[PDB]
Amino acid sequence: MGLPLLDTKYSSKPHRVASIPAVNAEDKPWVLDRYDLRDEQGLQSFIFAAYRQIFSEHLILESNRQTELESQLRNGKLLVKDFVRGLGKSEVFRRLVLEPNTNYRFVEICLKRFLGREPYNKQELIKWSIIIAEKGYHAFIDAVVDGAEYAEAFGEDTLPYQRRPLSQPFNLTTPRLADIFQDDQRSPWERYAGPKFFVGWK
């Protein structure tokens, strides 16, 4: 651990006040749980939903697929919380989500994907990012998934879902990278400067 964190300095959000049923039931996110793990097709749907929630449906590739966590989940030796934490502490998650972003945008993405709610304000990104800066995103992921808010909202057997009417999905608004220059890409104005390898009616 180390020093205590700063103040949370809350803000008014729908999740903070949710005594009343949401407006639309079909827009309520599916609360996937342990009883989904017993079937086979249900287990596949749960695994897909976990990858969509954490990896965001574009990182669902056969190369990004965590085989061992899926096997452990199939056995029942693994809690859903532990499956989520293992997806967080994975080489794909780091290499695709942590690396493009600063600590702060990574914190925002992690709040939206593990806790299901957008940050209260920038000072929350600031207060959370020091856990990364000082202990690694591994300890940050453990801090989120073992935190009080995660234990209250989802628990050990529920898969995180966005605590928002879902008519405004999180993955659409937040890509894994935003407004950075990529070393493997090329600026939009630039043109390819290399072999053409063919002449198709230019």
Partner 1 sequence: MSRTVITEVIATADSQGRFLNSTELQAAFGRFERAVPAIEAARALTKNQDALVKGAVQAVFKKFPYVTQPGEKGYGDSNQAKCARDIGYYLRFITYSLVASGTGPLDDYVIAGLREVNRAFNLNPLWYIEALNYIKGETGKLLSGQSKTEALLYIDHAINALS
Partner 2 sequence: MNDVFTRAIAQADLKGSFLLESDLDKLASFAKEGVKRLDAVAALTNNAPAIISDAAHKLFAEQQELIQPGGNAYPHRRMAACLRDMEIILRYVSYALLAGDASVLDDRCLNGLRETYNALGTPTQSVARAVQLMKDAAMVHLKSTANVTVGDCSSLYSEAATYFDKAAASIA
Partner 3 sequence: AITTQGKRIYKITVSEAGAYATNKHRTGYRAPIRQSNYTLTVPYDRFLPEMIRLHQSGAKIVNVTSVIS
Ligand X SMILES: CCC1=C(C)/C(=C/C2=NC(=C\c3[nH]c(/C=C4\NC(=O)[C@H](C)[C@H]4CC)c(C)c3CCC(=O)O)/C(CCC(=O)O)=C2C)NC1=O
Interface residues toward ligand X, by CB under 6 A = 3, 5-6, 56-59, 68, 71-72, 74-75, 103, 126-127, 129-130, 133, 169, 171-172, 175-177
Nearer Cβ to partner 1 (33/79): 33
Query: Rounded to the nearest whole angstrom, what is the least distance from the CB of residue 185 to partner 2 in the complex?
Result: 6
Secondary structure class of 163 (helix, strand, coil): coil
Query: Rounded to the nearest whole angstrom, what is the least distance from the CB of residue 24 to partner 3 in the complex?
Result: 21
CA–CA gap between residue 61 and residue 48 (Å, rounded): 11
For partner 3, the binding residues in 147-166 under the rule CB under 8 A are 152, 155, 157-158
Using the rule CB under 8 A, give the single segment among 31-39, 90-98, 129-137, 160-168 that binds partner 3: 31-39
CA–CA gap between residue 40 and residue 24 (Å, rounded): 30
Binds 56: which of partner 2, partner 1, ligand X, none (CB < 5-8 Å by kind): ligand X
Tell me if 42 contacts partner 2 by CB under 8 A: no
Query: Rounded to the nearest whole angstrom, what is the least distance from the CB of residue 155 to partner 3 in the complex?
Result: 6
Query: Rounded to the nearest whole angstrom, what is the least distance from the CB of residue 33 to partner 3 in the complex?
Result: 6
Q: What amino acid is encoded at 24 in this protein? A: N
Instruction: Give Rg (Cα) of the chain.
Output: 19
Judged by CB under 8 A, which of 22, 92, 126, 139 binds partner 2?
Answer: 126
Instruction: Mark residue 76 as left, alpha or beta (left: phi above 0; alpha: psi -120 to 50; beta: remaining).
Output: left
Nearer Cβ to ligand X (13/52): 52
Tell me the H-state helices in the chain: 41-55, 67-75, 80-88, 91-93, 103-110, 122-145, 148-153, 170-173
Q: Do 150 and 144 form a contact (C-beta atoms < 8 A)?
A: yes
Judged by CB under 8 A, which of 1, 2, 26, 35 binds partner 3?
Answer: 35
Binding residues with partner 2: total (CB under 8 A): 47
